[PDB]
Structure formats: C-alpha cells, structure tokens
Design an enzyme around this catalytic site. Structure first.
Site, PDB file in Angstrom:
ATOM      1  N   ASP B  78      13.346  96.461   2.742  1.00 34.72           N
ATOM      2  CA  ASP B  78      12.819  97.743   2.292  1.00 34.72           C
ATOM      3  C   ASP B  78      13.715  98.308   1.184  1.00 34.72           C
ATOM      4  O   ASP B  78      14.725  97.715   0.790  1.00 34.72           O
ATOM      5  CB  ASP B  78      12.573  98.676   3.477  1.00 34.72           C
ATOM      6  CG  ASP B  78      13.796  98.939   4.283  1.00 34.72           C
ATOM      7  OD1 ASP B  78      14.887  98.785   3.735  1.00 34.72           O
ATOM      8  OD2 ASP B  78      13.665  99.335   5.478  1.00 34.72           O
ATOM      9  N   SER B  79      13.307  99.441   0.613  1.00 38.30           N
ATOM     10  CA  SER B  79      14.006  99.933  -0.560  1.00 38.30           C
ATOM     11  C   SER B  79      15.244 100.734  -0.202  1.00 38.30           C
ATOM     12  O   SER B  79      16.088 100.968  -1.077  1.00 38.30           O
ATOM     13  CB  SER B  79      13.093 100.834  -1.381  1.00 38.30           C
ATOM     14  OG  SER B  79      12.987 102.090  -0.734  1.00 38.30           O
ATOM     15  N   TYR B  82      13.410 105.402   2.592  1.00 39.82           N
ATOM     16  CA  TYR B  82      12.839 106.092   3.750  1.00 39.82           C
ATOM     17  C   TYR B  82      13.930 106.567   4.700  1.00 39.82           C
ATOM     18  O   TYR B  82      13.925 107.721   5.156  1.00 39.82           O
ATOM     19  CB  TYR B  82      11.878 105.156   4.487  1.00 39.82           C
ATOM     20  N   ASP B 251       5.262  95.658   9.993  1.00 32.91           N
ATOM     21  CA  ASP B 251       6.605  95.719  10.555  1.00 32.91           C
ATOM     22  C   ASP B 251       6.679  96.976  11.407  1.00 32.91           C
ATOM     23  O   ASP B 251       5.999  97.966  11.122  1.00 32.91           O
ATOM     24  CB  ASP B 251       7.702  95.832   9.484  1.00 32.91           C
ATOM     25  CG  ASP B 251       7.858  97.240   8.954  1.00 32.91           C
ATOM     26  OD1 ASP B 251       7.145  97.611   7.996  1.00 32.91           O
ATOM     27  OD2 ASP B 251       8.685  97.994   9.514  1.00 32.91           O
ATOM     28  N   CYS B 289       1.329  85.095  28.752  1.00 32.06           N
ATOM     29  CA  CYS B 289       2.369  84.891  27.756  1.00 32.06           C
ATOM     30  C   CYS B 289       3.041  83.536  27.926  1.00 32.06           C
ATOM     31  O   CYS B 289       3.408  83.143  29.039  1.00 32.06           O
ATOM     32  CB  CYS B 289       3.408  85.996  27.908  1.00 32.06           C
ATOM     33  SG  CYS B 289       4.702  85.939  26.658  1.00 32.06           S
ATOM     34  N   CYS B 291       5.958  82.799  26.428  1.00 31.73           N
ATOM     35  CA  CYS B 291       7.359  82.904  26.041  1.00 31.73           C
ATOM     36  C   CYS B 291       8.275  82.353  27.138  1.00 31.73           C
ATOM     37  O   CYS B 291       7.895  82.204  28.306  1.00 31.73           O
ATOM     38  CB  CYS B 291       7.729  84.348  25.678  1.00 31.73           C
ATOM     39  SG  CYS B 291       8.386  85.407  27.016  1.00 31.73           S
ATOM     40  N   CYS B 294       8.651  84.462  30.359  1.00 34.93           N
ATOM     41  CA  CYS B 294       7.520  84.462  31.283  1.00 34.93           C
ATOM     42  C   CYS B 294       7.316  83.105  31.931  1.00 34.93           C
ATOM     43  O   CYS B 294       6.704  83.028  33.004  1.00 34.93           O
ATOM     44  CB  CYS B 294       6.257  84.936  30.557  1.00 34.93           C
ATOM     45  SG  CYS B 294       6.327  86.690  30.083  1.00 34.93           S
ATOM     46  N   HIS B 320      10.774  88.781  25.155  1.00 36.70           N
ATOM     47  CA  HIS B 320       9.364  88.787  25.518  1.00 36.70           C
ATOM     48  C   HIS B 320       8.528  89.607  24.531  1.00 36.70           C
ATOM     49  O   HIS B 320       7.439  89.180  24.111  1.00 36.70           O
ATOM     50  CB  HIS B 320       9.166  89.346  26.917  1.00 36.70           C
ATOM     51  CG  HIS B 320       7.754  89.726  27.168  1.00 36.70           C
ATOM     52  ND1 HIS B 320       6.784  88.792  27.470  1.00 36.70           N
ATOM     53  CD2 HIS B 320       7.116  90.912  27.039  1.00 36.70           C
ATOM     54  CE1 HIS B 320       5.612  89.403  27.560  1.00 36.70           C
ATOM     55  NE2 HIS B 320       5.789  90.690  27.315  1.00 36.70           N
TER      56      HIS B 320
HETATM   57 ZN   LIG Z   1       6.578  86.665  27.815  1.00 35.69          ZN
END
Ligand SMILES: [Zn+2]
Ligand SMILES: [Zn+2]
Lengths: 356, 356
Positions: B78-79, B82, B251, B289, B291, B294, B320
């Site tokens: 980003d710049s 912000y 994002d 999920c 991942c 999980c 997760h």
């Molecule tokens: Zn998960």
C-alpha cells in the site's frame, strides 16, 4: 512392544545412552520431554493445570490426552503436587481453584486416578516438595512423608488393571541436599520398586554447583538398570552436566518460556533477539541448527516480528528452541554411543560460555 | 513471464475469473491477499508500518522485502497514506513516529520511492483518504487532490527504471458514495493509465448495503480489461457480493485479527472458539475445511489452548482462518469458471447466515 523395557546401549563414565520401549513408542535416552502444548519421543502433561482446565473427567470423556492433543506417542504426567491451599495433612492436600472457586483434593490415590483418566503412559508418584533451603529435620520429615506417599502411589497404580498393564510408574527421590536422606530415600524407593526413578527437589534455586554436588552422590544410589529422571532441569549446560552424572531424562519450561520472552538458545549461548544488535543480522538464529526456522529466516526478520508484536515471531522462536533442545539431546546420544561425550561436553562448554 | 498481463478466462454476470502474470509468479483471480507477517499467490506489505520499523532503507540494505520475509512470489504494497500528523498540504503529509519521535514525510514521490526500496511487485498510488460520511464538496476536493496525486505517482514510478520495467502500478478511485465523483475519478485514472484500478474509500464503516450500492455503479466505470481491487474488504459475505459486482482482488486484516481474538471463520458463519459451548466439541473448526488444523485438531483442543493462554492456540486459529479465506477464493474461482457462481453465492449465504 512391552509395557516397559529400558536398555542401555552404551556408556561413557557415568553417562548412558539407550532406549525405553513402551506400547506407544520408543524413547531414546538421554531424552528431553517438552510440554505438549508447545522430534521428541515423549511429551509432558501438566496434571495440576489439566485437572483445573478442562478437568480430568472431561479429558477422559474426550478420549484421553492422546486423542485430545493429537499425540499418539508416550506421554508423561506429573503428579500435580508441585504446582499445588485449603488443607494439608498426611492424607493429602485440599485446594481451591482460582479459575472458578471449585474445591479440589490431591492425594497419592487421587493423583494416580487423575493420571489414569488423562491416559498417560508414565505416571509420577505423588510426593511432598521440599523447599530450599531446608533444615535437616524438615528435609527428613518431608522425605519420610514422600516415601509413605510413594508406597500409597504404588498400591493405587497397581489396583487399576488398565494402568498396571499398560503404563509405568516412577518414584521420586527426596532428601534436599543431605546425602544420608538421599540414601534413605533411594533405599525406600528401591524396596517398593518402580519402573524408573526421579531425582526430585533440585529445581529449587540452589545453583548449578550445588545441584551437581548433590547429583554426584545421589544418582549412584538409584538402581543402575532403570531410568533416572531429573525433574525440572534445565538450561543446556545443566543438561550436559547432569548427563555426565548419570541422568537419562529431563523436562523444563525454559525452551517455551524463553521463546515467548525473546530468548533463543544457540550453540554460542542464549541470545535476546529483541536487542537492537539483531536488527540487521542476516544469519539464522543458530548457524548449525537444522530446524525449519533456521533454514528459512534471519535473526533480523524474527527480531522484527517480535518487536512488531506479531504472534508469528514467538511461534518461530519457540519452534527453534524446541528443535535446539532435541538437537542437543541427539548430539549427546551420538557422542556417548561413539565414546566422545567427554570431548563433546568440553567443546560444548567452551563455545556456549564464550558467548560469541 | 511478462511484467504484467491480466487475462480473463471466464465470466458469469459481472463476475470474472482469470490470472495476472508477473515476473515473480501468477496470481489467480479473484484473489485474497493476506498480510505477509501472518495457498496465497501474493501477500500485502504495510508500507506505513515498514517505513517506521525497520525503515525502508534498512529493508533495502537487507535485500528487499522478498528476501527479508522469505517470500519469492509477488508482493503488493500500500502507499502508506491510509495508516498515516505534523503537516498536511498539496505536497503531501508530514508526521512524527510514536516509536522514536523521528520525522517522516509522505508524498506521491516519496511513497513510490519507499515502495521501490521495499521491492514490491504491485505499487499503489498515493492518495488522500475520504472520511465517511463526507459532504459532496469535501468528497470532491479529496477526490480531485487524489487524482493530482495519481498523476504524480505515475510520473514518479515511470522515472525509476527498475520499477517501471519490473513492477506494476495501480490507481485508486475515490469519490465517497457519489456516482458523479466516482465517474470523474474513473475517467481521470483511465486517462493517466494504470495496470490495475482499486476502488478506494469503501472500508469506512458504511455498512454492506451501501458498499454494494456504490460498487453497483462504480466498478463498471473502471476499464473492464484490467484488474479491480477492493481495498480493505472484507468479511466472507462482503467478498462474495463484491465478486458478484466485478471485483478481482481483496485484502483485509480480519482473518489475522480474528485469529488472535478467538474468532474462526466457518461455512456456517463465524464462531467464538472461547465460548464454553466448544469445550467438549470434537468436530474440527470447520467440517469441510482441508487445512492442516482441521485435519488434526478439535474445537475442544483449540478452545483449551486459547483459554489457557497458549500461543499455539492463536497460531492454529490464524492458520485456519488464512486457509479458509483461500478455500473461499478457490471455490469462487471454480464456480465462476464452471458457470455456477450465482448458485454458489446463494448456497453460501443460506448456510453462512443460518449459523448452524
Ligand atoms: Zn481449517
Ligand atoms: Zn533453529
């Protein structure tokens, strides 16, 4: 595998290397046993913590600690007494939880039962900790009670068929710094009979010289053919010197405590990664470490993560410290097996304390 | 690969799926871009934070952000404006660091230069954020300044050969909630010409209905053949609805913020894992999920870790949540490519908001 078999494969001086075979796995010794909520062959569960959150009956309802933690290898549980007030007596101790005010009791029998509910593989006898310093009279009284409690622990363990047939029980030597009391304690424990023998009461702030002095006479009193566990020790140099004195097993919160507080263990001594001197240091935490952190990231990046408050920084520090401890134990085991442990210990100390 | 090539592989309504090819890698769109200090094809670096710690010149001395973070794929910065006071003017902004009192300036030119020192692949033009709510006059003044700053950003980027040849530059549409100002802003940005176009000023607390209303008219104003980046958004349902309105990139700090504060994203909505209802729940965080968390651990164990204060709990939650967001984007991309995104969005909302 058998319920419990300890074999010594090689020796150098008082140091030994070998294996403990249990139903869930083999433990290579000398062993470092990390806390499981932090590779290792066995992890430690904190009975006092677990009995207060989520509770031993709840852990059992969830399938036991192995299922709960996702760890199918051996687990050692402490008795709960060290961390453990509403009442203290020859029966045991009563205490109130700060979490919710609930009342709890611990005794040899209740501690064994809680460790049964948790499903651990190595069970510690319930004992009475001896403060440091202690007078001879107080150390003797505490050790004598601990030996009565060791017999009660033995009997409670033996009464629970699933535990007696599938787990192991360790007794704990007490006696403070007094040789005669250490001898009486060792004799009492050997008469009862245990699968392994811990040296208790030496993580009490006495300093390394005194700890080594007590280990010098205390470890030879225990049965040679069984494992020797130094509870609550310690720093890398403590471990090396304790192995030189016949210790086979270790546990300590230092790697995880340090990792959450900016301290990394290296072969050149501990470093505080938050110090500004690491802000531009492109070397890994340790230049020989094979851990995943040191293969990928610099001191400078880990410094930045911790200084920025990013959880990732403490996680990488903890991962590195746990791995460092396991690499230390591997180097200890290999050097004893190869007959070069005395040289390793000398080289280790020269570099670790130079702090380069 | 080229410096920058965006290709649209499939469309459904206003939704698109495709790829951005850059020298360091391919970015699959719609894309979620996690913060790098938290799989993803691109990560976000926080210029404001990095310019204050460890500093842009220091990052460059350490080899740039790719080397520093151990990430060889694209990075978007980003710049800095912000998050960015000692003075504000048509030139830029001056501000004093709370970390150490040092003085800092940001301007279109300085922001581009800092992003060059960081070595990012996608560079954001420096703009003036518009508060919400804003009057038409204030929104117009802020948007007009932002467009002057967009031209200055373009010129500064083009003057730096390594940046012009190897990185890409995105412009940022402003105009608050006002259709005419959004149109003027889009026209000005397209006249200057950018590699991609962000919709700025919509992570300001306006509520989802208003955000979607502004996206309805604002996204069609941008060039169709370039990526559309909605900055600072958002929750899973925000992302789905924004894709339905033509957004390609996202994002948000939510996955990592939530993971450190007990909140896990699931296909049945967010859950607060600290709640007592999870103390005995043996299901994984989410039942679909894929991942690593999980696959291995229960809600009950993660609940316990967080309640006990163990760093591991927040790490597993964050892992997760990051993975959930990437699985969401994968399902979005597949459904658009297969012509079933409208159905996916309907099914997603029905389940996510049922909260079962
Ligand atoms: Zn998960
Ligand atoms: Zn390492």
């Amino acid at each position: 595998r058998p319920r419990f078999s300890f074999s010594i494969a090689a020796r150098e001086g008082k140091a030994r290397t070998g294996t403990i075979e249990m139903k869930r796995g083999v433990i290579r010794t000398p062993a470092f046993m990390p806390v499981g909520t932090a590779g290792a062959d066995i992890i430690l569960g904190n009975t006092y913590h677990l009995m207060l959150r989520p509770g031993a009956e709840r852990i059992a309802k969830l399938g036991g600690l192995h299922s709960f933690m996702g760890w199918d290898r051996p687990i050692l549980t402490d008795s709960g007494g060290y961390q453990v007030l509403t009442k203290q007596s020859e029966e045991g101790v009563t205490f109130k939880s700060h979490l919710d005010g609930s009342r709890h009791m611990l005794s040899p029998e209740r501690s064994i039962e809680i460790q049964h509910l948790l499903g651990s593989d190595i069970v510690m006898a319930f004992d009475e900790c001896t403060p440091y310093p202690a007078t001879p009279s107080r150390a003797a009284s505490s050790m004598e009670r601990s030996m009565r409690w060791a017999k009660r622990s033995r009997d409670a363990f033996d009464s629970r068929k699933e535990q007696a047939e599938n787990a192991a029980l360790f007794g704990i030597q007490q006696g403070s710094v007094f040789e005669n009391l250490r001898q009486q304690s060792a004799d009492a424990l050997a008469e009862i009979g245990f699968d392994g023998y811990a040296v208790g009461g030496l993580a009490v702030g006495e300093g390394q010289d005194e700890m080594f002095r007590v280990l010098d006479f205390s470890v030879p009193m225990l049965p040679d053919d069984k494992p020797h566990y130094l509870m609550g020790v310690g720093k890398p140099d403590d471990i090396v010197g304790a192995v030189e004195r016949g210790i086979d097993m270790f546990d300590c919160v230092l790697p995880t405590r340090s990792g959450r507080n900016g301290q990394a263990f290296t072969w050149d001594g501990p470093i505080n990664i938050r110090n500004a001197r690491f802000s531009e240091d492109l070397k890994p935490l340790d230049s020989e470490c094979h851990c995943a952190v040191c293969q990928k990231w610099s001191r400078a990046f880990i410094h930045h993560l911790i200084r920025a408050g990013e959880i990732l920084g403490a996680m990488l520090m903890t991962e590195h410290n746990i791995a460092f401890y396991q690499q230390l134990m591997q180097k200890i085991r290999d050097s004893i097996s190869e007959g070069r442990f005395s040289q390793f210990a000398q080289d280790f100390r020269a570099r670790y304390f130079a702090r380069n």
